[PDB]
Amino acid sequence: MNPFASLTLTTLIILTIPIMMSNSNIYKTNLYPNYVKTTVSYAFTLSLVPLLMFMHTGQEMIISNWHWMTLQTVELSLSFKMDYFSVMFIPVALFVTWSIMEFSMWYMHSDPFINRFFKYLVLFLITMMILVTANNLFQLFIGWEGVGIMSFLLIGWWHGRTDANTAALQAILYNRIGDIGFVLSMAWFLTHSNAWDLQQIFMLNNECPNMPLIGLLLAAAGKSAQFGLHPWLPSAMEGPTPVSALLHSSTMVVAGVFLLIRFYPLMETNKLVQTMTLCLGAITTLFTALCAITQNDIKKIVAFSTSSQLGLMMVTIGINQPHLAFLHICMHAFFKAMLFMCSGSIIHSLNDEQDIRKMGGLYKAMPFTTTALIIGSLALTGMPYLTGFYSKDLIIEAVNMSYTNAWALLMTLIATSLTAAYSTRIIFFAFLGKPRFPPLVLINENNPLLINSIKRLLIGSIFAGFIISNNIPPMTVPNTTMPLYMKMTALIVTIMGFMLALELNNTTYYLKFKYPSQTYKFSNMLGYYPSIMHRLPTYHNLSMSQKSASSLLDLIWLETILPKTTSFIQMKMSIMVSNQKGLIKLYFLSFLITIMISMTLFNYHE
Amino acid sequence: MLKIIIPTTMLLPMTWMSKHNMIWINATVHSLLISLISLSLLNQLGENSLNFSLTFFSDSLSAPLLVLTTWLLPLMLMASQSHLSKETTTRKKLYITMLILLQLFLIMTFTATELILFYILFEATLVPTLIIITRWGNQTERLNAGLYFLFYTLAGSLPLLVALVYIQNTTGSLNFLIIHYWSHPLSNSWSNIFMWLACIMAFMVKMPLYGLHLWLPKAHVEAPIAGSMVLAAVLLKLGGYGMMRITTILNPLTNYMAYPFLMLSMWGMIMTSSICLRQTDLKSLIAYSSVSHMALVIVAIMIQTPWSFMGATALMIAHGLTSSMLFCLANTNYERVHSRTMILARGLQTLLPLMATWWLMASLTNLALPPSINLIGELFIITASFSWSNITIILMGMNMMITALYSLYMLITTQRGKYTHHINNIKASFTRENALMALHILPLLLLTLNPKMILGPLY
Amino acid sequence: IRLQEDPDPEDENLYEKNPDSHGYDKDPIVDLWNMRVVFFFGFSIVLVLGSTFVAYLPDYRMQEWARREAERLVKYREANGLPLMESNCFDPNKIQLPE
């Protein structure tokens, strides 16, 4: 019982302190952002200590704190799982959040509600560590929507903008469809396995979790923005650049993938579902990357590159490689977040313009950002002996050296080449070209907040994988006997992806007749996916609510069957009874009949 | 219970004899004081319910619901001294007379030890309510609304009355305890089926019911704000409370003759939630939203599962507190814009920052995100439904879709977006409005720490 | 003149007369006390004092007692060798089966 118990849990409660102090409203309402950042900085330094504790020995621990509920046989209690997955991801999540917080002080240094913004970031940050550190599935649920809802406000930061509300609403919907599988998964485990803690779920062998894992797969797909539900991530670009730089880059969108890593010991047994994640993983890599290259917004292109990445680890999830997928999260976290505020550095400096058509020549004009961008681009390509190499090439090497689906391999290989392809487009259009911005140039990065924030992630990205891979204990079996021509293909495929993409991109220099290729017309318009999903079903369900449902069913038919028909029947009969003639001759004639029927026909006499 | 019933009555002579302008202040403070006294019933033994006397007894179901009523009475009183201070003292005093009487019937109904005793005041709540909608309502269609509400619940109450007295003539007393201990398996004979319908339709017509939900848009939208909370927060639970109390002499006929009602409620909530997604009136959207949640409660009771009841009680009280708070939200705009169309007053976050926040966590609580007991309510029902049938989740979760879209859609349309140009009446939120709304959400969050109290008799 | 009626009275602003108006009552001093007394008899006396009341009641639903009562039964039951929980609660020996 070493301080490992206290240290990890202190990191969570320390993160709550800025929120608790903010609730006073007598708080540091002038320099709140600096107060928040230094708190995360303290927790980052503190959260290192549990790492080396696990690093030295491997002490994974369960902290079953205050007992909440005693549902019959089910005991719901706040419990944190200090697994290897939780124990090291917290420093990484704290590292990126610290890095951007300094950038957030620079980028939105003029927002009148900047203090409220920094409060939201901690609220999102808090919900994430709840998601990462969660034993019972209820806590996993707590962090799930808690992350999900916090994305809504942050995306709708500029609530005056109409489109931001649409994207914010769109993000909730696509994430909500994910929770259908999550809720389904919870119900099955509480019924069959009769618990929600990971301990019982793994012990109570559920090695035939066909529907539960399908629910788990659907939960990951919605949150991590795979195929089927991608387009909310590209539309999530409408929020502030820091919100894009942290949540949707490598902290919020990972949550869907991270669930599969947690449930790996039960996920591996079922062969059908792990082929489904190969199915979803392969298509997600292509379509996101395929739409990536033909885009123009810097934030869109970068985001599409992320959604291509989230396609990767689930491909690795299927073929008994969860830990490499989880390791892939770490390395992807560093450079992918980095690529955002470097683009954020360009965006704010060059008068908040996101169209790649309006930069060029920023290589010698923006030295540090140009260095940071190309470092991230090289890392993003798995180029050797860097952050990307220690994850991506091992992934591409492992995916081929296994009994998998053939069509998935062709897609992952093509995606990696396309992954480098749009990376050249970013460097070619944004930096290596003649300047195209408005005349009055204000580009500058000399602000220390911008320099230090990017530099920290720079020196992180250079080594990162080297330290982590050499340090974490062996947890899988690295295959060794394997021929050369798919050993080199981890780097071969991206060499062309650099090569012909450069040739096709520089072809714009030549004065040539312009012609929209049909495949480009398909790719550039997000593969036509929003124009059908976001228009056809949305129109039908809304129209069904008006024509049917509200009008036809509720207040036209349901209101006329029971209520109105009875009222009409009573009205007609009330007319019959009340409408008399006041004639004694007719009244007494009725009496005679009644006397006759009673004495003869009613048969009362007999 | 006499420690609550007598004090609740005692406000009526006091309010009728208080000073001219001290009516609201004096009534509110003792009304809060009574709710403090009613907090005493939260304790429940691990066994038989607290039976104070033959006249009154409280269980782990009545007590959480009872405190909701007593905690509610300050909320209508504190929500009504703005749209009634322009009326004479006597009519204002009469308004308190209805509200106090409305509570007294609710307190006695939820604590009735005899089934027929339950029936009288449970039905007798109509008279104080029917006055509220028809007298102090603020629209023309309120009169047709009053007829719609009164007749629709009376059409089911009478068959229950004939059913209850029939059980008296066949099984003796209908005391809740002796009924539970003296249980006879109901045969599948045709008469028992019709007896089953009589003992059930009275309560099932009362929450909403898909097909029998037409009175909520008439009543709730047209009712005065003080009343409008009650038609959605507590009396819908009267139709609820009856269900778990009466579904102990109907087993196992409820096992079979429940598919038409279960089928109507499951598909119905998807329809009525879809109504919310395409509604025009702010109050109607809230009222129809209450239909979907209440239909979820209807589904929950009809499986007779420990988990189902366990989340059933939590859902009702969680929904009741929320629906009241949202009806406070509709009132806040209603005083300023003097209209109920949603798109008339968009852009309130820029003008009213805190009122936008109050609209925020109110929407999330209706969103039923964890750990808010709305989630612990719905999620428990999902598992009970899932164990009953695996296809339920397809219908179960699809409701979570619609309840997500329209909840933020009501938020996004009103709060966010550009402020309405032509309005110049929106003033700073009165401290009454903000304080009232805090007294709604804060106990709702405070209940999240220990939902063991609200879980219900099955726990 | 159609009918003998008055025009719609213009809505009055409580802030217009007294900027310190809380929206509770029109008359200032009682309005100020209305805030003071629906708060005082609100959060502190009910929300705060009721919470610590409802947070520290005696054992509800006999939870703690049941667990400790259960634990001793396990300790006896493991020592013998028979299963930790009988599948027949009511003793079959004092049970009659109609042939």
Binding site: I575, S578, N579 | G137, N138, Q139, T140 | L3, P9
Partner: peptide, 26 residues
Amino acid sequence: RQWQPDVEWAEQFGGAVMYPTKETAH
């Protein structure tokens, strides 16, 4: 203000019968 019945609402009650009919229309 709270809406109140008007003469058109009153004249609806003002007929010889609540529910008009050509027999009672005179």
